[PDB]
Amino acid sequence: SEPRFVHLRVHSDYSMIDGLAKTAPLVKKAAALGMPALAITDFTNLCGLVKFYGAGHGAGIKPIVGADFNVQCDLLGDELTHLTVLAANNTGYQNLTLLISKAYQRGYGAAGPIIDRDWLIELNEGLILLSGGRMGDVGRSLLRGNSALVDECVAFYEEHFPDRYFLELIRTGRPDEESYLHAAVELAEARGLPVVATNDVRFIDSSDFDAHEIRVAIHDGFTLDDPKRPRNYSPQQYMRSEEEMCELFADIPEALANTVEIAKRCNVTVRLGEYFLPQFPTGDMSTEDYLVKRAKEGLEERLAFLFPDEEERLKRRPEYDERLETELQVINQMGFPGYFLIVMEFIQWSKDNGVPVGPGRGSGAGSLVAYALKITDLDPLEFDLLFERFLNPERVSMPDFDVDFCMEKRDQVIEHVADMYGRDAVSQIITFGTMAAKAVIRDVGRVLGHPYGFVDRISKLIPPDPGMTLAKAFEAEPQLPEIYEADEEVKALIDMARKLEGVTRNAGKHAGGVVIAPTKITDFAPLYCDEEGKHPVTQFDKSDVEYAGLVKFDFLGLRTLTIINWALEMINKRRAKNGEPPLDIAAIPLDDKKSFDMLQRSETTAVFQLESRGMKDLIKRLQPDCFEDMIALVALFRPGPLQSGMVDNFIDRKHGREEISYPDVQWQHESLKPVLEPTYGIILYQEQVMQIAQVLSGYTLGGADMLRRAMGKKKPEEMAKQRSVFAEGAEKNGINAELAMKIFDLVEKFAGYGFNKSHSAAYALVSYQTLWLKAHYPAEFMAAVMTADMDNTEKVVGLVDECWRMGLKILPPDINSGLYHFHVNDDGEIVYGIGAIKGVGEGPIEAIIEARNKGGYFRELFDLCARTDTKKLNRRVLEKLIMSGAFDRLGPHRAALMNSLGDALKAADQ
DSSP states (O other): OOOOOOOOOBOOGGGSSSOOSOHHHHHHHHHHTTOSEEEEOOBTOOTTHHHHHHHHHHHTOEEEEEEEEEEEOGGGTTOOEEEEEEEOSHHHHHHHHHHHHHHHHTOOOTTOOOEETTHHHHSOTTEEEEOOGGGSHHHHHHHHTOHHHHHHHHHHHHHHOTTSEEEEEOOSSOTTHHHHHHHHHHHHHHHTOOEEEOOOBOBSSGGGHHHHHHHHHHHHTOOTTOTTSOOOOOTTOBOOOHHHHHHHTTTOHHHHHHHHHHHHHOOOOOOOSSOOOOOOOOSSSOHHHHHHHHHHHHHHHHHHHHSOSSTTGGGTSHHHHHHHHHHHHHHHHHTOHHHHHHHHHHHHHHHHTTOOBOSOOTTTTSOHHHHHTTSOOSOTTTTTOOSTTTOOTTSOOOOOOOOEEOGGGHHHHHHHHHHHHOGGGEEEEOOEEEOOHHHHHHHHHHHTTOOHHHHHHHHTTSOOOTTOOHHHHHHHOTHHHHHHHHOHHHHHHHHHHHHHTTOEEEEOSSOOEEEEOSSOGGGTSOEEOOTTSOSOEESSOHHHHHHTTOEEEEEOOOHHHHHHHHHHHHHHHHHHHSOSOOOOTTTOOSOOHHHHHHHHTTOOTTSSSTTSHHHHHHHTTTOOOSSHHHHHHHHHSSHHHHHHTOHHHHHHHTTSSSOOOSBSSSSBOSTTHHHHGGGTTSOOBHHHHHHHIIIIIOOOSHHHHHHHHHHHSOOHHHHHHHHHHHHHHHHHHOSOOSSHHHHHHHHTTTSTTOBOHHHHHHHHHHHHHHHHHHHHOHHHHHHHHHHHTTTOHHHHHHHHHHHHHTTOOEEOOOTTTOBSSOEEOTTSOEEOBGGGSTTOOHHHHHHHHHHHHHHSOOSSHHHHHHHSOTTTSOHHHHHHHHTTTTTTTSSSOHHHHHTTHHHHTTTTOO
């Protein structure tokens, strides 16, 4: 008539040790079984917690936070025992988080993380414990026959968890289970403690048993059919129904009812979707006021540059002060001033120190304030970039500038970010490894007892394409179905690989970024650590950490901004000779004829994004003369636009062929003037699809961002309301309707796939600098690009060819001139970077330089080796150096020196 049983012990694959099903499928299973509630109690972690809350909301199930543990106490010796801890409330959730972090921080061995039982004295309130059945403190001791020991245990829970500790009973046809229960029942009865049924769940369906066994062998490193393989699981450990459970425990309805009682007792709030900002350093002045002070000051720099130093300014300056007012009042009203301040500061620090930040910027850049703060470097009014596409007062959201830097610099930024906000408020972020296509076949093959060669035959048939799946591999490679039909072993293989594909095997590897908290990180996420209790990371990954409301900064391997950096040093050092102030890649005008000519010719080698094949043949196929269609580029180079035949209409519509209309040949208006000029008529962007709601029908833009999302969330009722609000507002703004109910019909299909222009222009700018640099500073730019590609000998040779094809001097290796990096001669000739000689490397190079900077230096081969410290200049390095042509201006050719090297190396050691 209502709930009889909810599951209080369940692993998903985040347990890693075991488990099969992910977090959302368990939640649906529980929902389909008609349960109101569901604990996922993964093994010493809460990795899936944020995903659990999201999925529960969506399905009408209440999440019960908890975790399983190996537990250790003096009473049982070195024998580890099982406990389940549930969080009944938010005090409990915190203690549970503190536990898990304590297990990990302590370090651990082959046995895995463990907690000491005595930790459960301080870390207590708000937790409910389940005994662990036959493998718990109390269960093992009942099994013994040691009445006393049972008592010294039972006393501990009586002292510390008075009505908060349950004798767990489990019927999964495992050994000692039915003896334990029978004793535990007698214990509860006698000592007056409560019992609870659990099914110790590991997989959704009984038939998944074999898949889970395999999953475990892969973790444990055993072959399926090894007699020594630990077999700790039963086919019974599946997501059993309410009916199935009441039948299993019919003799003890209290064990079931206590399920339901515990579930009602557990209510943990996990707020999602909203920041907990940390506090910015502000001294006096409210956070709200400091933002306006520095946003206004910022705008003072931007206004003097843009509309330059002559006092016209005021001619369209009001529009600027105007828009900043609007944003400042929204940011402040929504609680975000600190978010801008802390990105603001960070971005400045990285410009100041030696850290390039990726383009990214999110949908920011539509924010005048960001530009004022120099978080972004485009003028949003110039390119009709919208603030409301980034922060909309009409909607609950988290503004994200999607800022990222390269992982290698992690140590530096954590350092600084910990100056700002405090050591333990700062932390790295976990990443998980899953078993993709190739790996899962490799591993299931191993487990099923095949030799490498057998299994590898199937693996080679899996394409290497990123994000490849088995289903797709079966689509693209006709040999896969073929052999799957022919070979039972091969089909057994793949059948199981298919159940294991995508399961979580472990943590990185490496972190995914850094997170910043308002206080201690453990007030927000638990910690995971390695065997040594080191490399602490939050147990919630990137996305999860986000949605829990921490400010985060991702890692990215993005050599593009590092190149721009290097070339920029190279340009700015040529200033010391010239002078001529230093360059600000930001003071670049975005209307440079010589750069646009360069683009129009389509020599876009080494220029961000558009260096592909098809791109060079669309640059040419339309010839962009301004910055505004640089933005357009990446929106056009897409499968969808050309599938319909939209790009075609664009390239003609410029010059071109045909004729300007706002938008369609018939269906057009004049007030759509400024909104479509930059894009030659066509609605190219989402920004513009809001803007035509705004000036035709008159939406507040905030309102217009909503219409757009509705056209995204196509459902009749939301759209029918808006279908008339547009149609009524067309008369309100005046005049001609009827036309409206047709331009609206098709603006709803120019925005079905329109680009995020603010996103587009973030990247376009970085491309434009890259273009500029090449046009204006070829020697330095190409130098820098060559420095980034130094690992790959083949790409370097491709680049020198490019250098010579664009007509630049490129000098092969020389020991007297060359450096590590690749640079520019006093004569503007690229000097080869010795790093580019595979095999040498930074140490030996470094050494050579320091020796050259000591006595000019380097008559012949002998002169070097004699000075150079031997074994820091390994003979291995001297052959490599010889054989590149480093000494070819200064005496004998390669061969003759390879027969002189031996002797050269004896005259040194003196």
